[PDB]
Amino acid sequence: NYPAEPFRIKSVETVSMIPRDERLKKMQEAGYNTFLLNSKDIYIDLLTDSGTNAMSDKQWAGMMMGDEAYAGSENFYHLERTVQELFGFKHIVPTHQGRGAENLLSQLAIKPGQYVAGNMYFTTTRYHQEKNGAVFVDIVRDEAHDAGLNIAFKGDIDLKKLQKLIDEKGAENIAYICLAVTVNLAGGQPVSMANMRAVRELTAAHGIKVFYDATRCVENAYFIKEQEQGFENKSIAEIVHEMFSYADGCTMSGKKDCLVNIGGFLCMNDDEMFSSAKELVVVYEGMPSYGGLAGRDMEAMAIGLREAMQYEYIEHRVKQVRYLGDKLKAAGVPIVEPVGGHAVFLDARRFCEHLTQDEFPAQSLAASIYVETGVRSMERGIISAGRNNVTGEHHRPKLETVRLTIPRRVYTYAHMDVVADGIIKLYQHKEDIRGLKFIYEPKQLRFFTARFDYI
Amino acid sequence: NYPAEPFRIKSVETVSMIPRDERLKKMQEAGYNTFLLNSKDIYIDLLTDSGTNAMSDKQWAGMMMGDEAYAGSENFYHLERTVQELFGFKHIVPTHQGRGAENLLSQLAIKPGQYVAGNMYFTTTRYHQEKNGAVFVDIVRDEAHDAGLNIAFKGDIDLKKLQKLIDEKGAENIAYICLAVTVNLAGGQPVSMANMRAVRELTAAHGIKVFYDATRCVENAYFIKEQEQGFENKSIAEIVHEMFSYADGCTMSGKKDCLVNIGGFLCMNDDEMFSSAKELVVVYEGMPSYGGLAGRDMEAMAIGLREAMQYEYIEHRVKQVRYLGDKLKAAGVPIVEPVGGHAVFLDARRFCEHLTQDEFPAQSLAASIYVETGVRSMERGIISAGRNNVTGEHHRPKLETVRLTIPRRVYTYAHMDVVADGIIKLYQHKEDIRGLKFIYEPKQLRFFTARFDYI
Amino acid sequence: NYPAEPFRIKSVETVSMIPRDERLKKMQEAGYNTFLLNSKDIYIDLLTDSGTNAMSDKQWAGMMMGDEAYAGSENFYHLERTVQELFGFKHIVPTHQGRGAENLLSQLAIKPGQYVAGNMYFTTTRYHQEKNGAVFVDIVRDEAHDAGLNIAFKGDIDLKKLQKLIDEKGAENIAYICLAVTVNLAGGQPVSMANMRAVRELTAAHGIKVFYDATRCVENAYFIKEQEQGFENKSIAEIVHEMFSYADGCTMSGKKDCLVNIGGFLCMNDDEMFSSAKELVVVYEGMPSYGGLAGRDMEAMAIGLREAMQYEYIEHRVKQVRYLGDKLKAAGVPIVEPVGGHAVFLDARRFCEHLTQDEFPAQSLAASIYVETGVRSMERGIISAGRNNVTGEHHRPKLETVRLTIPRRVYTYAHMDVVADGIIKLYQHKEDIRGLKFIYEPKQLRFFTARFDYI
Amino acid sequence: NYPAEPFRIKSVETVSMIPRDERLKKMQEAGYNTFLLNSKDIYIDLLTDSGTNAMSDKQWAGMMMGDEAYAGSENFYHLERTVQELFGFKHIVPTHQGRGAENLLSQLAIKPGQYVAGNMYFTTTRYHQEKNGAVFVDIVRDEAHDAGLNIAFKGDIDLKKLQKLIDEKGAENIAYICLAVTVNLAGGQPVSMANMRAVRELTAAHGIKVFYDATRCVENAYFIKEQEQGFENKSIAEIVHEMFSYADGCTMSGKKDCLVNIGGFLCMNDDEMFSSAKELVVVYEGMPSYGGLAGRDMEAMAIGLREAMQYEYIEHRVKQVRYLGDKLKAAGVPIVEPVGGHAVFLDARRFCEHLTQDEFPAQSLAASIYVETGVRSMERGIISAGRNNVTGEHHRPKLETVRLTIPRRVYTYAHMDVVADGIIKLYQHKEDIRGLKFIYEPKQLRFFTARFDYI
Ligand SMILES: C=C(/N=C/c1c(COP(=O)(O)O)cnc(C)c1O)C(=O)O
Ligand SMILES: C=C(/N=C/c1c(COP(=O)(O)O)cnc(C)c1O)C(=O)O
Numbered sequence A, B, C, D: 001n002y003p004a005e006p007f008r009i010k011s012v013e014t015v016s017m018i019p020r021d022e023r024l025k026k027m028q029e030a031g032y033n034t035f036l037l038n039s040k041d042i043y044i045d046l047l048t049d050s051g052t053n054a055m056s057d058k059q060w061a062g063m064m065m066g067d068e069a070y071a072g073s074e075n076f077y078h079l080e081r082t083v084q085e086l087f088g089f090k091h092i093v094p095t096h097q098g099r100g101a102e103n104l105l106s107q108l109a110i111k112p113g114q115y116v117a118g119n120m121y122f123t124t125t126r127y128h129q130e131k132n133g134a135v136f137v138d139i140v141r142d143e144a145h146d147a148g149l150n151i152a153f154k155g156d157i158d159l160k161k162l163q164k165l166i167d168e169k170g171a172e173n174i175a176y177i178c179l180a181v182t183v184n185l186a187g188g189q190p191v192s193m194a195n196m197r198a199v200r201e202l203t204a205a206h207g208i209k210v211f212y213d214a215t216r217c218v219e220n221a222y223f224i225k226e227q228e229q230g231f232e233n234k235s236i237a238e239i240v241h242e243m244f245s246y247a248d249g250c251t252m253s254g255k256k257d258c259l260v261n262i263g264g265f266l267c268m269n270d271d272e273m274f275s276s277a278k279e280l281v282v283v284y285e286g287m288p289s290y291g292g293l294a295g296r297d298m299e300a301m302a303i304g305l306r307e308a309m310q311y312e313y314i315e316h317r318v319k320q321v322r323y324l325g326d327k328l329k330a331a332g333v334p335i336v337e338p339v340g341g342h343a344v345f346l347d348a349r350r351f352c353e354h355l356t357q358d359e360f361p362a363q364s365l366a367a368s369i370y371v372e373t374g375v376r377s378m379e380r381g382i383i384s385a386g387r388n389n390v391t392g393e394h395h396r397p398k399l400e401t402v403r404l405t406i407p408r409r410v411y412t413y414a415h416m417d418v419v420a421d422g423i424i425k426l427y428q429h430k431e432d433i434r435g436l437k438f439i440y441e442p443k444q445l446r447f448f449t450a451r452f453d454y455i
């Protein structure tokens, strides 16, 4: 079953519908790197679900009531009581987006030499942990590393790995547990409530803190409602509130599940840490009552978080992504499984098995997808992994994928069909996809501006 | 066959359905007239494509640059030159919507006792004609009155009927020819360029004026591009400009094909009529420099008329309607054919063969659709046709229909599937729909607020 | 005393600040007719207070929540309950602006041959009365015709004139009393509560209806609060509610005191007339639940009417106009007295006493004002009176004025100083102002497009 | 002397004052720190000109055309080319506001142990310098530290101090010169073009880099046009472009002179520094293609920076501030002189001569202003100066001031009169203001959330 959109269209965004021949010229002018395409040349932009969401009429009404005061804005108090109501944490500090909150948390909660352990990681999150002296430890269940394995709650932490870390390093040497919902690196996989409670139980017995990386916590809550036994009579809001009852705080990117184009925040329960967070936010972000956001954006984020609690909205959000994954799977196209909350990942290693990883199959597949459909997708393979600048060799990731990342409330099932139909057509003559080589490679951040040409 | 939306969703609004028990209460509280239901109590609102359209980001940017000056507004100058460029008429008078422009035309162009001849009637148009003393003559071809007959360009005027009217009544007794594009009450049926040419040549030879109802002229232009030999490679804008070259002026409801929520205008080439038009607009609408519109709405209408010329936009608009009709026809649901530009018309005579037209089956079917589905649709049969102003009897149209009217850029194919799947289910107990009778009948335009009860 | 603005600026409208030499070229290109100037060439636009108001952040939030449904819009229900609460009438029909409501009222309430009597008149209001067969009778107090006489509540109806009309024509032959608040033709003069009650008392004894032309009823209520003994402890809302308790209905232009750029409505208490109004509004305006307005505009007008009830807003509105009048009066510049609620009228006959009325002193003064300051003002003298087309002679009004009409919440006291300082400078060498002659004069609506040159 | 607003009011927001009894409660609940008061409880909010500006209609039209794409946004390209055109720097990295750009510059450009030398300190700037290991050296001329001394271009660097620092420490030990325009904590004092030239020539001869704090560069350009010989006929844009020609890069808070509510950026000419800057921005702000800003805010900032170049706009901006200072000085109120570009600084040492600086008279005066007036103002003295990081004692600035900071395009001269009239009244019982002491002191940037109590 795939539900209809539980909303109608209030206003549209113009696009140009340039045809295939012209798309090829734009792809060549971008050096076959979709990160270099101009937004104005793109019909369906699946580069990311971050900050690309469509807001509602109610959010846009809030955008006209921005109280732009430097301190004490009504919009901050609205955001504050909304997050306190829906997440249940005592204190909240706004930040301009998620990595601003991570900066603060890692400076507040880490002593050099300590460990942070998590269910895999995200690049900014782990950077701020390591920048502040922590050693990262993956404690996700082994199954999460098998990208073909179709099992539920693949994001769950292996409690035995957590126990082993505690035994070998000592509780006083673990800064905190970083529990992400959902788990990005595994393809957007959810964590069960049973797992969040077991982790809270174990850590609490040793005095260890747990902070959630909560950026897709609403997609996560929908998976719990759909698939965890006993939650079929619970509302999304009830599930979200219980999830965070097992954390000491969180970092949140409103740009994902709060349905906004900018915004984030930091939550915590501890008064002392809250006091310290207020001393630090002024350094990097702004006042404890705006945190690097315009008043109108704290307002849009307060309204959007509350909209995200509607069951039909998040059911349709997740099932629209599933529709795309299901259609590709039915045609035999290789994808990471199960499909996650926010994106479908094509397995470009298998899609282009006539190409070596040194010929950048994910990068080339993403270029072909744009030329054939006007769809932009993100390379998430060897190019994005970067190069070891000590040795000069590529970092070679096991996952060589193209990410079809779906913004919330922007596209329809007919756009999903455009995407799927083009990919399926490509797959039917996949052996024609050509390898790529660098013709310009910057020293750092190479996925952003590198240019290629066909081998 | 069915293209995806040639735009993205920029902002949304929520939709909801109240339980069947509650819809039943709402429907009897509205006296079984869909026009009397409240917006909140509706899930997918197909009452009309008039004024319900979704605007684009460019239009909303224009809405922030409303120049609200009483005379000399930049927005007026933009609307004026846009209409002069795209329609080719010498002079433009804005009005707050289409029936304001009809009020002006009918007062300017009709001497009492004269005839006005058009391709089928429309409710407000015919009222303003008769209120100023004209007799309406229907000169559409006979086929346009038979719902099931699938022929192209059903909106065309019968040149033999036009010729007969001239011979029997004399050209000086004909105030003007009223040529509507598309023809709404025939089901949204288009008029060919050949027919517009032939009507221009015959009327010009007798000195008779021709005024167009331009309200859905862009839908009409699409049908010409798609189906009239020789126009396959002309742009929508070129087709529109050539259409109006066969006319002396037009009335326009911008609330339809100009993609706005309010607005209309009157165009003419004649200098003396324009002078008279400016005198009269002041009485009813406003100064000729804004015509009962805010500046920002003149701007939105100027921008939207030009957006409507985009081929992919209007192809998708029309094919989305066609999709709904195709799905209903594939299931045996009786509809007006061919599907028109803006709506699917269910054939109430066949949905409700157990009822005579004096039991108002179209009014009754629209009520039942709301109760079982929460979808709102409009009566388009004997109730809308009004009464003969000489005999006091119902006008008795052969087309007794219920209109599923599609606002532009608001809904998706998934919403069309919800509508279609629901009507297909109602079709399978069509015998349950009861006949209706008046308990309150207005003295004119009675369909708007009439109240009925079951027989 | 002159209060500070009881609001701050949320957003600004760009203007060009072209200098004097360039303003002279624009005035010449406009044929020395300020009605022909382009809005983009004007610094301070005092042509009219109609539809030119600045909205609040709350209104603009409402503009993002337009429910554009054809029937049953939430925005209509908001407008409806707001007007019922604040004005106290039983029924309300929206119209696109005031003259739409006048059209409806005059068709509903007049039998040909009857009289309508009022405290002077407004052009659209009287047109719709006469178009429907009424003979207009001025029953304003004689003082209102003395433009130099500085007395309170100059808009009051002479009860003895009303009594005389009843005695001479008979009550059954009077369609209604049209009581305007404030009185435009006398310069914006208020009516006392004592007068509204005496008129209600007298008419009610004869079964005669009273309908208010309520377009500046809030300015009127402020004058009652400031100057009528016994109302110093009443809120503006309490005064407004009591005012309308003495009418059977009203016509309202939201474009004036409801702080919007478009919108109006018709109110009445009688069920039968309400039913008849709903039958007629569909003819000219739209549905009883939108009346020729987008949903967002019914919303903005509902919010704005309520904002207009704030005492500090309307005190500042009226006292900003008074500031302008007081400053001019102190320099000896001749104005209509007392200054009204919405505009200052310069007496161009006295300002330019070296010019005959046939040399259009008001028209010329308005041209000089624009050249010296970038301020546009309206000619309200012989040109606007038009020409007797039977005899060819000018209509020669006693008042030969330039109207400095002040939009609500748009300008500051420093803009008022620009206006006053420029006029005072002109007055100090008033003998240099040259007479004007026609070089193009249209047959009708001559103030709108006539062009002049210096004698 | 004082020009009127070179714009009209497009939309408003309401202002209100709570009773003195309630302001007293609010002030003690905020621990006598103005930063802790709530926006709703303030009547005229002069806490800061940062992020509080009113945007124009053109900017708000841009806000409807946010291109929210992660890379390649039209809004990014517009901001980039606007800054390249107007400032002349080769490369731009957007940041969410100014201290994000300072974070990046200080990490890129400082080796631990090096010196950074600037024209007076600023709070966040100096924190990022010292946090990355630099020692701050103040090389402004001595006069900038004496509040009462009325001399032009008080912001100028003392070239003798710069020369001395080079000789005593060696150019390789100076990380860069930090030249701020205007100089905020000297009272908004401008820097001359001659001084920017001379600093460029001396630093270039030793290979020392110069980075500007551009936050109020347009105010600065106005002072140059008004007061520096030879610039009287140069445009504001020409002056701005020449200023930045003497710099190697800049940090910008667009929240000041770019007329927006959020936004900033980092500019530089060096290719390698730009590459490093892009690596680092990802960690803290976002991708280099949006830098922690929504697309619509990049657009608003591109539009606003160009609006700021309008002469009449910035003349009025500065002269409105000057008006407030002139009125206060005419009454004997002690202020920093000359009045700067963005604010009037009351001299707390003279308003509160009965207090020593250890009793925090500036913090105390800001509290009392709120209680007696409801106007919010900011502490700018010993509390903001922080503590010496080697000795632990207060930094002891000669300037102990309370800032009346004027947001751009928000208030009127009538609002300035309200502020001035209120401060003049407080001046006449200045002896009543009590001394303060810390009850809560943050470890850095303590002024933001410090809590005090009366001594
Ligand atoms: C209201 C409808 N149509 C309006 C209309 C009108 C009247 O336009 P306004 O609704 O803008 O007055 C004139 N001519 C045609 C062919 C029309 O379809 C409708 O069909 O729902
Ligand atoms: C917050 C203020 N100023 C910020 C500022 C900053 C920091 O900018 P952000 O507030 O955008 O971080 C940098 N440099 C100067 C000269 C500044 O004035 C203020 O003065 O109120």
Ligand SMILES: [K+]
Binding pocket: A050, A051, A052, A261, A262, D068, D069, D293, D294, D295
């Ligand atoms: K974004």
Ligand SMILES: [K+]
Binding pocket: B050, B051, B052, B261, B262, C068, C069, C070, C293, C294, C295
């Ligand atoms: K509408």
Ligand SMILES: [K+]
Binding pocket: B068, B069, B293, B294, B295, C050, C051, C052, C261, C262
């Ligand atoms: K207007």
Ligand SMILES: [K+]
Binding pocket: A068, A069, A070, A293, A294, A295, D050, D051, D052, D261, D262
């Ligand atoms: K702000």
